[PDB]
Design a protein around this motif. Sequence first.
Motif, mmCIF file in Angstrom:
data_model
loop_
_atom_site.group_PDB
_atom_site.id
_atom_site.type_symbol
_atom_site.label_atom_id
_atom_site.label_comp_id
_atom_site.label_asym_id
_atom_site.label_seq_id
_atom_site.Cartn_x
_atom_site.Cartn_y
_atom_site.Cartn_z
ATOM 1 N N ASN A 181 0.779 -1.322 -0.133
ATOM 2 C CA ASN A 181 0.203 0.224 0.210
ATOM 3 C C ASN A 181 0.859 1.196 0.130
ATOM 4 O O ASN A 181 0.541 2.255 -0.572
ATOM 5 C CB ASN A 181 -0.989 0.195 1.281
ATOM 6 C CG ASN A 181 -2.092 -0.935 0.830
ATOM 7 O OD1 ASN A 181 -3.282 -0.321 0.452
ATOM 8 N ND2 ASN A 181 -2.037 -2.197 1.419
ATOM 9 N N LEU A 195 -3.079 -8.847 -0.415
ATOM 10 C CA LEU A 195 -2.630 -7.570 -0.741
ATOM 11 C C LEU A 195 -2.896 -6.760 0.606
ATOM 12 O O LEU A 195 -2.165 -5.770 0.904
ATOM 13 C CB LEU A 195 -2.924 -6.982 -1.894
ATOM 14 C CG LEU A 195 -2.223 -7.479 -3.071
ATOM 15 C CD1 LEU A 195 -2.828 -6.596 -4.487
ATOM 16 C CD2 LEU A 195 -0.995 -7.129 -3.157
ATOM 17 N N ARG A 196 -3.724 -7.090 1.447
ATOM 18 C CA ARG A 196 -4.258 -6.263 2.611
ATOM 19 C C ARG A 196 -4.332 -4.854 2.285
ATOM 20 O O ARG A 196 -3.739 -3.891 2.833
ATOM 21 C CB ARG A 196 -3.043 -6.323 3.545
ATOM 22 C CG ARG A 196 -3.036 -7.742 4.456
ATOM 23 C CD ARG A 196 -1.421 -7.966 5.121
ATOM 24 N NE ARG A 196 -1.711 -9.072 5.991
ATOM 25 C CZ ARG A 196 -0.678 -9.465 6.468
ATOM 26 N NH1 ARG A 196 0.269 -8.673 6.527
ATOM 27 N NH2 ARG A 196 -0.701 -10.541 7.272
ATOM 28 N N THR A 197 -5.216 -4.554 1.370
ATOM 29 C CA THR A 197 -5.855 -3.214 0.957
ATOM 30 C C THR A 197 -6.904 -2.950 1.505
ATOM 31 O O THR A 197 -7.685 -3.817 2.255
ATOM 32 C CB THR A 197 -5.686 -2.966 -0.634
ATOM 33 O OG1 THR A 197 -6.901 -3.817 -1.092
ATOM 34 C CG2 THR A 197 -4.366 -3.404 -0.942
ATOM 35 N N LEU A 199 -9.888 -3.049 0.096
ATOM 36 C CA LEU A 199 -10.905 -3.788 -0.521
ATOM 37 C C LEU A 199 -11.086 -4.969 0.393
ATOM 38 O O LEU A 199 -12.225 -5.493 0.121
ATOM 39 C CB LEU A 199 -10.266 -4.392 -1.951
ATOM 40 C CG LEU A 199 -11.339 -5.056 -2.655
ATOM 41 C CD1 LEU A 199 -12.519 -3.978 -3.010
ATOM 42 C CD2 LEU A 199 -10.636 -5.214 -4.102
ATOM 43 N N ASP A 200 -10.442 -5.052 1.534
ATOM 44 C CA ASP A 200 -10.708 -6.262 2.376
ATOM 45 C C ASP A 200 -11.966 -5.926 3.316
ATOM 46 O O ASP A 200 -12.363 -6.782 3.823
ATOM 47 C CB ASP A 200 -9.392 -6.701 3.375
ATOM 48 C CG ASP A 200 -8.357 -7.218 2.561
ATOM 49 O OD1 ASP A 200 -8.561 -7.579 1.238
ATOM 50 O OD2 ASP A 200 -7.246 -7.044 2.959
ATOM 51 N N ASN A 227 -11.975 -10.376 -5.051
ATOM 52 C CA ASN A 227 -11.294 -10.572 -3.813
ATOM 53 C C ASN A 227 -10.517 -11.771 -3.930
ATOM 54 O O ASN A 227 -9.633 -11.927 -3.052
ATOM 55 C CB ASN A 227 -12.395 -11.088 -2.793
ATOM 56 C CG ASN A 227 -13.488 -9.891 -2.530
ATOM 57 O OD1 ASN A 227 -13.640 -9.043 -3.008
ATOM 58 N ND2 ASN A 227 -13.965 -10.129 -1.398
ATOM 59 N N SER A 272 -6.351 -2.687 -10.429
ATOM 60 C CA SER A 272 -6.165 -4.018 -10.645
ATOM 61 C C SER A 272 -4.611 -4.287 -10.744
ATOM 62 O O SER A 272 -3.875 -3.356 -11.148
ATOM 63 C CB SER A 272 -6.613 -4.779 -12.032
ATOM 64 O OG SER A 272 -5.837 -4.344 -13.002
ATOM 65 N N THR A 306 -5.606 -9.547 -9.796
ATOM 66 C CA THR A 306 -6.737 -9.578 -9.031
ATOM 67 C C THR A 306 -7.107 -7.966 -8.750
ATOM 68 O O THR A 306 -6.386 -7.154 -9.348
ATOM 69 C CB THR A 306 -6.486 -9.987 -7.328
ATOM 70 O OG1 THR A 306 -7.632 -10.167 -6.746
ATOM 71 C CG2 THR A 306 -5.259 -9.093 -6.846
ATOM 72 N N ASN A 307 -7.927 -7.594 -8.146
ATOM 73 C CA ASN A 307 -8.526 -6.053 -7.990
ATOM 74 C C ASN A 307 -7.925 -5.850 -6.525
ATOM 75 O O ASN A 307 -8.105 -6.767 -5.745
ATOM 76 C CB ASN A 307 -9.824 -5.995 -8.313
ATOM 77 C CG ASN A 307 -10.128 -5.856 -9.848
ATOM 78 O OD1 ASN A 307 -11.163 -6.724 -10.105
ATOM 79 N ND2 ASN A 307 -9.906 -4.928 -10.475
ATOM 80 N N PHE A 308 -7.906 -4.480 -6.428
ATOM 81 C CA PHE A 308 -7.750 -4.111 -5.180
ATOM 82 C C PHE A 308 -8.217 -2.489 -5.115
ATOM 83 O O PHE A 308 -8.686 -1.986 -6.107
ATOM 84 C CB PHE A 308 -6.057 -4.223 -4.521
ATOM 85 C CG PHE A 308 -5.179 -3.212 -5.297
ATOM 86 C CD1 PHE A 308 -4.728 -3.582 -6.548
ATOM 87 C CD2 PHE A 308 -5.006 -1.964 -4.886
ATOM 88 C CE1 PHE A 308 -3.755 -2.582 -7.518
ATOM 89 C CE2 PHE A 308 -3.795 -1.134 -5.617
ATOM 90 C CZ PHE A 308 -3.371 -1.492 -6.812
ATOM 91 N N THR A 334 -7.441 1.673 -3.258
ATOM 92 C CA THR A 334 -6.900 2.698 -1.905
ATOM 93 C C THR A 334 -7.968 3.463 -1.586
ATOM 94 O O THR A 334 -9.271 3.589 -1.818
ATOM 95 C CB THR A 334 -5.668 3.338 -2.543
ATOM 96 O OG1 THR A 334 -6.104 4.207 -3.707
ATOM 97 C CG2 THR A 334 -4.500 2.651 -3.168
#
Length: 343
Positions: free
Chosen positions: A24, A149-151, A153-154, A168, A192, A279-281, A283
């Motif tokens: 991030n 990824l721990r963004t 989006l979680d 996800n 992405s 995958t998607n994420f 911010t």
Amino acid sequence: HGAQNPSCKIMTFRPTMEEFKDFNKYVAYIESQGAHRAGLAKIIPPKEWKPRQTYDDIDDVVIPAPIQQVVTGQSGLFTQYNIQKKAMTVGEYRRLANSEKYCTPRHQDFDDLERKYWKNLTFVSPIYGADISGSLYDDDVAQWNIGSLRTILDMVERECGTIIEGVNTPYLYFGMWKTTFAWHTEDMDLYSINYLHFGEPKSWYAIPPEHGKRLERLAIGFFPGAFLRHKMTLISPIILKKYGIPFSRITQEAGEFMITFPYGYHAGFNHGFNCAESTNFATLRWIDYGKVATVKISMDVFVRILQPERYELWKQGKDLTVLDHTRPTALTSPELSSWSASR
Ligand SMILES: CN(c1ccccc1)c1ccc2c(c1)CCC[C@H]2CNc1cnccc1C(=O)O
Ligand code: NI
């Protein structure tokens, strides 16, 4: 901010291992440099990092739903259909990709290969092992693990428990020559991340998000009908350069990361046999991009928690803002810190 990348060039980044440990934080950095203004950015990881130790166990993996990409059209304007075919293994797919029918043609340079792509698009329908639910990472990989990824989006899974595959969860993309992904933006205008595990290059066309509306007017001009969310419209760069749509091109090679940014229109093709993971994420900056977008995620939880002063005005439909595609994202907010402490 602004005026970081005024030309909207596709920027390439080569971080050290210390810059690479926090995912991030590095996304905030490349946006502080203006990478988001091109809609697409390449990240070259350091050589100490390797996502998987070996790729020899993969021949027995199942490709559940390969698709035969049937493209119709003429003069740089095309429409591709995706017909589902029988299941096959990766060893079978590799032997089919290097078959004479699907193998990469002889080409002098990329300009020659690009010319043969748009010239032979109609003639042969390639097979694309796309959208496979799975990952090729090792379990111990802690940096830039596409599976985790721990963004922010979680918050969907951590609060509402919804799990959406390819958004996800990671997706796998086994490709061959001429396999194409059409002009599109990510679901809910999300970010992405795409990593090329091995094999032949994957080429990308990208339009800066501040000109994405010019592509949307162009496509509406050709078909009198958010239909580009069908993700099956192909436009040649000859057409884009004729009507003045700004775009850049870059080639992603084995071992390189590609980031797509909110409202960043991208499209491209594979040069030959390769494997990609995606995958998607998101911010903090994406929340306003997902609000204006209304696979359908409910933005309520993002606004109720991270934009609580605007929540009731958003439910009443009175939050009408214009996106500033040049503003870089923030790394943290007081609402996000108190939310991680609650979980
Ligand atoms: C038509 N379709 C559909 C549309 C609406 C809902 C359900 C599915 C659909 C959707 C997705 C795809 C295809 C077709 C055909 C191959 C490509 C993948 C997407 N691949 C990428 C996307 N962004 C970046 C890169 C790639 C890549 O190929 O590496
Ligand atoms: Ni995409």
